[PDB]
Write an enzyme that holds these catalytic residues in place. Structure first.
Site, PDB file in Angstrom:
ATOM      1  N   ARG A 192       0.764  -0.769  -0.223  1.00  0.00           N
ATOM      2  CA  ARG A 192      -0.071  -0.050  -0.426  1.00  0.00           C
ATOM      3  C   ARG A 192       1.313   1.646   0.035  1.00  0.00           C
ATOM      4  NH1 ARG A 192      -2.163   1.591   4.537  1.00  0.00           N
ATOM      5  NH2 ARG A 192      -2.118  -0.300   5.074  1.00  0.00           N
TER       6      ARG A 192
ATOM      7  N   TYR B  76     -16.744  13.675 -17.910  1.00  0.00           N
ATOM      8  CA  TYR B  76     -16.621  12.415 -17.896  1.00  0.00           C
ATOM      9  C   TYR B  76     -17.783  11.537 -16.938  1.00  0.00           C
ATOM     10  CZ  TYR B  76     -16.300   7.555 -16.597  1.00  0.00           C
ATOM     11  OH  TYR B  76     -16.650   5.811 -16.008  1.00  0.00           O
TER      12      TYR B  76
ATOM     13  N   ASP C  32      -7.162  16.131 -16.551  1.00  0.00           N
ATOM     14  CA  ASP C  32      -7.626  14.868 -17.326  1.00  0.00           C
ATOM     15  C   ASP C  32      -7.177  14.566 -18.629  1.00  0.00           C
ATOM     16  OD1 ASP C  32      -7.901  12.268 -17.703  1.00  0.00           O
ATOM     17  OD2 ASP C  32     -10.328  12.165 -16.671  1.00  0.00           O
TER      18      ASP C  32
ATOM     19  N   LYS D 258      -7.712   3.445 -20.530  1.00  0.00           N
ATOM     20  CA  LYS D 258      -7.910   3.841 -21.379  1.00  0.00           C
ATOM     21  C   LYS D 258      -6.691   3.322 -22.784  1.00  0.00           C
ATOM     22  CE  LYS D 258     -11.861   4.533 -19.693  1.00  0.00           C
ATOM     23  NZ  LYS D 258     -13.123   5.884 -19.539  1.00  0.00           N
TER      24      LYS D 258
HETATM   25  C1  LIG Z   1       0.625  -3.448   7.325  1.00  0.00           C
HETATM   26  C2  LIG Z   1      -1.026  -3.152   8.127  1.00  0.00           C
HETATM   27  C3  LIG Z   1      -1.410  -3.816   9.166  1.00  0.00           C
HETATM   28  N1  LIG Z   1      -2.768  -3.327   9.822  1.00  0.00           N
HETATM   29  C4  LIG Z   1      -3.480  -3.206   8.331  1.00  0.00           C
HETATM   30  C5  LIG Z   1      -5.009  -3.088   8.975  1.00  0.00           C
HETATM   31  C6  LIG Z   1      -5.506  -2.802   8.250  1.00  0.00           C
HETATM   32  C7  LIG Z   1      -5.817  -1.818   6.586  1.00  0.00           C
HETATM   33  O1  LIG Z   1      -5.573  -2.553   6.104  1.00  0.00           O
HETATM   34  P1  LIG Z   1      -4.753  -2.758   4.121  1.00  0.00           P
HETATM   35  O2  LIG Z   1      -3.549  -2.305   4.564  1.00  0.00           O
HETATM   36  O3  LIG Z   1      -5.178  -1.537   3.605  1.00  0.00           O
HETATM   37  O4  LIG Z   1      -5.344  -3.754   3.167  1.00  0.00           O
HETATM   38  C8  LIG Z   1      -7.142  -2.333   8.588  1.00  0.00           C
HETATM   39  N2  LIG Z   1      -7.556  -2.442  10.199  1.00  0.00           N
HETATM   40  C9  LIG Z   1      -6.970  -3.526  10.637  1.00  0.00           C
HETATM   41  C10 LIG Z   1      -7.211  -3.829  11.874  1.00  0.00           C
HETATM   42  C11 LIG Z   1      -5.793  -3.644  10.520  1.00  0.00           C
HETATM   43  O5  LIG Z   1      -4.586  -4.249  11.064  1.00  0.00           O
HETATM   44  C12 LIG Z   1      -0.727  -4.219  10.512  1.00  0.00           C
HETATM   45  O6  LIG Z   1      -1.254  -3.557  11.374  1.00  0.00           O
HETATM   46  O7  LIG Z   1       0.739  -4.325  10.640  1.00  0.00           O
END
Ligand SMILES: C/C=C(/N=C/c1c(COP(=O)(O)O)cnc(C)c1O)C(=O)O
Ligand SMILES: C/C=C(/N=C/c1c(COP(=O)(O)O)cnc(C)c1O)C(=O)O
Ligand code: MET
Lengths: 387, 386, 384, 387
Positions: free
Chosen positions: A53, A106, A178, A203
């Site tokens: 991310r 768009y 854009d 696109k």
């Molecule tokens: C590197 C990420 C960790 N955590 C993430 C996390 C997310 C965020 O989810 P995405 O990372 O956007 O899939 C949402 N909700 C909870 C309770 C989480 O632990 C971590 O703590 O190590």
């Protein structure tokens, strides 16, 4: 000066394990050498990765390729053009700010700006940006951004990017463009004065109709950092496999765009001379209002444009009797696509905006592909000449 | 009566071209039969697809899977957990609204709620949600939402979702629960009265550490429609390849969770009785404050929890002399991960909020995988002796 | 146990990536002419071209190698690629092969149609009896090829005893252990020279990849296998190697469940009035249960049972709501098949009768679903 | 007639679930409606799928594309060019048969014909196939196949495919042509009298350096069924993801080939006139022996060819001081590759064949990509002009 063709085929960066193709980093996380090495990376000290991310090497490779053609300080890739658009606007605009945007955009951009931005306290006016005097008249003390699409989807309406940039620069507003419809081969908004240049990579950039993705590029390191800061929390990410596909598609971008441009112009001239066709809105035609601006500010044309039939029934008969063109929304694919804006891509645009966008049931939009142009023209001609 | 294992292995839906595995629809757009058929689809009339941002069959298959386990009206997949969280909050909250959120959240959730929401005119109070009376005291006439994580990341602090849900029902606010830490096998917020249940799919659900994704599930048809409407414009999408991988990962979710649960419990009890450990925060330990609410409201435990060393030097020594456990952020992967919250996952959270969270340089967060638990215990044991 | 080894394979991370990257590439760059020249001579570390070696594929090879106890493993585009490379890499005009009389359909096709066009004498015999192997022996016999338990009847061969004959008489022993997986059957540990699998089945286990793998006891033998692969060209794609390694992370855990589910289902069928007989190696009633309990540490979940007629088999196979009618096996979900008219339809009638395959047999591959749900599905389709 | 570009962009077949791009059928098996429906498919009765080794929809889609450009009765895709070669030879040849093959072939083809075929009791002679009289002189009552690469890898030696086909057709032998170096845009062996045309798809057809794969196309339904019957037992399969990528790469094959051809000829003419260069073996040069046959029997040229330096040291100096060209084996990629046949692609070729092949340490092989041709020439020129 090395050609863009060569630059895109030879991007900066080390090979990974001597791999000729850049590997797909289908991973969520990365390993740390030590507690300090990881802590440092979180503070932005040292070279390396933490978590996809925040940054993924395959996606970063694609961003560098876009960054190299835009002439940007940096680029950020997203899960869609709408991700790029949201992150290029809401990363900067806050409650009490004012945005001036074009009145022909768009559909989902109209949705973002007219439905969501006002819920966040952001004031929005949709203005005819083909006239700089109207842009000035709509300017307020709290105006922070102007957002343009040019040529607009789907009418190809041309805005004077350079002239509007002057006003933004004198008055402390960001200019966001854009450039999806034209591609970074032919339109480089950062060379015209824009602060941010974005694309639906779905696109032309990817070009193969098999990924949805967005990209945004900023003139300033600070602006691209703020965009990525927003992306980190809003979460519109380009997947590693999609980045691999987009970088691969982009390897043929310059030559595809050359063919698209030439095909599109030839198809537009054929239609312009045809008895059944009332008008053709291609910005490369001399008959087109704004042709003089497009020709000065761009170094070519995309191949998606709109034309006017004599009736809705005639539009339907054409669109439904084609063997080469495919009836579908989207554009910028290697193969030719055709659709009906009034009932499809722009069936969701509020009527107040439909009328001043100039979209009627007689209009058909074609996205000319890289098929042999004579085969495309013969397909249109046979359907136009039906019993 | 059909078991969850069977349900995930036998999703509802037609096979495509008789294919046993569900195909990867790596496409942006879909073809129309006729002008009318396309115009009908744009109006929500008839069955079919238009464009992957609006709907992709491979993504929808994964969404149906999650929707089945949550007991939801519908589910929406995203490019990341943060995409699910952003879309489950900003789809509903607008200027002048007020949000009550737990004080102990994932770092980027704090950044979202603390930096971006107030720029959009949304009022936000972070409060101790393990005490329902504190939620009631923080209430205002414009409160529209309570947002919870339970057990919280990373301290595992537990909130009474069920009691807070009653307060939300009574007072006209949505309850949104991030159930990432526990997975939908063991925590089903919609059964407890929540309006929305969401996960970082990146963790347990996918479970193989090779995808970032989010999912959100809503009790009502109207709420999930609103979420997808926000997604259409915000543009956090799950890629078709990632949906293919998440669905595939989820086929083993129940057995993986069972092992994760048993493994994590055994590792926490080893640590709790070790001479070098000041305390272990695992919601399934009898000693843990909030254990009693967690055993009642959940049907099991995830295997991510934190423990306290005597100093920062000790923590540093432990984390850096492990041979099996991997030093890395993230959680819920098949292999064991370990992390230092103070300077990694929660480094950017303002001092103010961080001290409210009880996060100190002496805490280490472990995410116990599905290795033989004896190899994990021996790895830790080995390192704790140097 | 095995789970820890599969989750922590040897080797360096690439760019600190936690998951091993997918090297979707054909070629590799050289630092200099000399470094390229050296690599083509086998000097130094590195890669040249994916057909010779791909890092993502090599990581999966290494995983299988470790579990088999081999000198090396080679991955292929299918189990048939592994089979043909583990045989035709060694056998040549003038050689004699002894093979089990009961084999997967395409293996019969390979040994029966292709090998003799290449001047290789082949006899199919009953390898469940070691004396029959000794009696079929000739002075030019260079290999014995086995599946145990056999596809589809689960016929069991004494691998250790056959290996002894092979070592004494100078022949290679090659064993297809597809039906059981390397969690439960390790042929190289039993004296075999080569052990191979269709990775399409249990190893990957998710029904979304076709692949093969072969493992040799000696460095020379695996080098020969890869040299043949180089020219024959059955490769595992980098994406498929990524998916196979991923599927293999849950292998020991899936096998535990397959084995237990398969044994419970088999016993249910064994005592169902409507079922004539059940061919599961882990049942006491099955002939050669004793050898299979000795030489294996568990059982796969694919086996054959006999109905009272074709009409009855068709009725069972066509009124199942959880089980899917499809060829293949070792998937996470339950599959069911009719050998006589599907997997084994092309087998010559004379090899067919010697195998014991009739229209009354149904082959089930028990998944990891809740057992009671599988049993309840079979129950309603047998009774209604 | 409709253009090849259009044909490749518009393949026969129905869409799957109205998907514009053809889905990736990442599956091993397929479901049966009933015992009868499954039984029937096993007998070749009815429409449908069984198991990906027998047929996969994504792979079949790529096969149809190749079949359409070759003008074949059918095509079979494999896991590599070597899979296609093995399956196009050993599907037909048995103990007692004789094969005549060219003496200048891809290294692993030499390995296959020279190490493996004799072990299977097949007699093999490698012959200078640029002389039809030498082919006739090598013919025996048991000759069943002639196998040619033309232009050969790496020397570009041209064989008279038409003339050799006459002999094959009069005497009951199959003619098999490996057309990898030229691509099916420019060389169609089935129009010249061959029975089978095959390619390493790893090279031009896919064109993006990210897949290994093969394809073989037969003039006769019977021969393609035999090829697939062999494939089913030998097991060299194209993976569904790789078939998706090859079909995608193939969407730009005609335009890529046009640029490869033009680039390669301009680079060859530049090298031909450069004082450091002794000789240039590109079949489109008038100086090239066999240029006259190449120009009559092909409709263009690939862009992989070989040239002679004055010494091994000069070849190494050149190869190691390029910034655009990449030192690597393989060919037919969008970006330019360069290698040393004597110590790399043909370093395993036994000394008597490598003598007859004319491969010496002074030779460098270049695979010219689609970068701007002036950037490629400037990169070569700077390395050739070094201190
Ligand atoms: C590197 C990420 C960790 N955590 C993430 C996390 C997310 C965020 O989810 P995405 O990372 O956007 O899939 C949402 N909700 C909870 C309770 C989480 O632990 C971590 O703590 O190590
Ligand atoms: C559809 C396939 C079935 N079997 C396959 C198989 C193979 C061949 O494996 P690829 O299919 O080439 O990966 C090798 N060895 C054994 C014991 C097998 O069962 C089946 O029986 O239903
Ligand atoms: C033995 S290296 C194979 C790569 C390719 N066939 C070439 O000639 O370059």
């Amino acid at each position: 000066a090395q050609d863009i063709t060569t630059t895109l085929l030879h991007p900066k960066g080390d090979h990974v394990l001597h791999s000729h193709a850049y590997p797909i980093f289908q991973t969520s996380t990365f390993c740390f050498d030590s507690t300090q090495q990881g802590a440092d990376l979180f503070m932005g000290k040292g070279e390396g990765h933490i978590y996809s991310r925040l940054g993924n090497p395959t996606v970063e490779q694609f961003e560098e390729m876009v960054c190299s053609i835009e002439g940007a300080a940096g680029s950020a890739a997203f899960g869609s053009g709408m991700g790029a658009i949201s992150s290029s606007t809401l990363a900067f605009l806050q409650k009490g700010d004012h945005l001036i945007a074009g009145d022909t955009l768009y559909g989902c951009t109209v949705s973002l700006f007219t439905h969501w931005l006002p819920r966040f306290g952001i004031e929005v006016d949709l203005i005819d940006t083909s006239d700089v005097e109207k842009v000035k008249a709509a300017w307020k003390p709290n105006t922070k951004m102007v957002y343009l699409e040019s040529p607009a989807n789907p009418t190809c309406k041309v805005s004077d990017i350079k002239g509007i940039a002057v006003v933004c620069h004198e008055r402390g507003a960001r200019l966001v463009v854009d450039a999806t419809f034209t591609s970074p081969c032919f339109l480089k908004p950062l060379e015209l004065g824009a602060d941010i240049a974005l694309h639906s990579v779905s696109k032309y950039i990817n070009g193969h109709g098999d990924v949805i993705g967005g990209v945004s590029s900023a003139k300033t390191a600070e602006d691209i950092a703020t965009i990525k800061f927003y992306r980190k929390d809003a979460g519109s990410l380009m997947a590693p496999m999609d980045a691999f596909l987009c970088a691969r598609g982009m390897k043929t971008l310059p030559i595809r765009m050359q063919i698209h441009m030439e095909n599109g112009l030839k198809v537009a001239k054929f239609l312009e001379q045809h008895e059944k066709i009332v008008k053709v809105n291609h910005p490369g035609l001399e008959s087109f209002p704004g042709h003089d601006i497009a020709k000065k500010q761009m170094t070519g044309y995309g191949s998606t444009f709109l034309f006017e039939m004599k009736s809705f029934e005639a539009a339907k008969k054409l669109m439904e009797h084609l063997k080469v063109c495919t009836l579908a929304v989207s554009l910028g694919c290697v193969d030719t696509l055709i659709e009906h804006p009034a009932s499809m891509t722009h069936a969701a645009v509020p009527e107040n905006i439909m009328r001043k966008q100039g979209i009627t049931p007689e209009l058909v939009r074609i996205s000319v592909g890289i098929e042999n142009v004579d085969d495309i023209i013969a397909d249109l001609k046979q359907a136009l000449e039906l019993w």
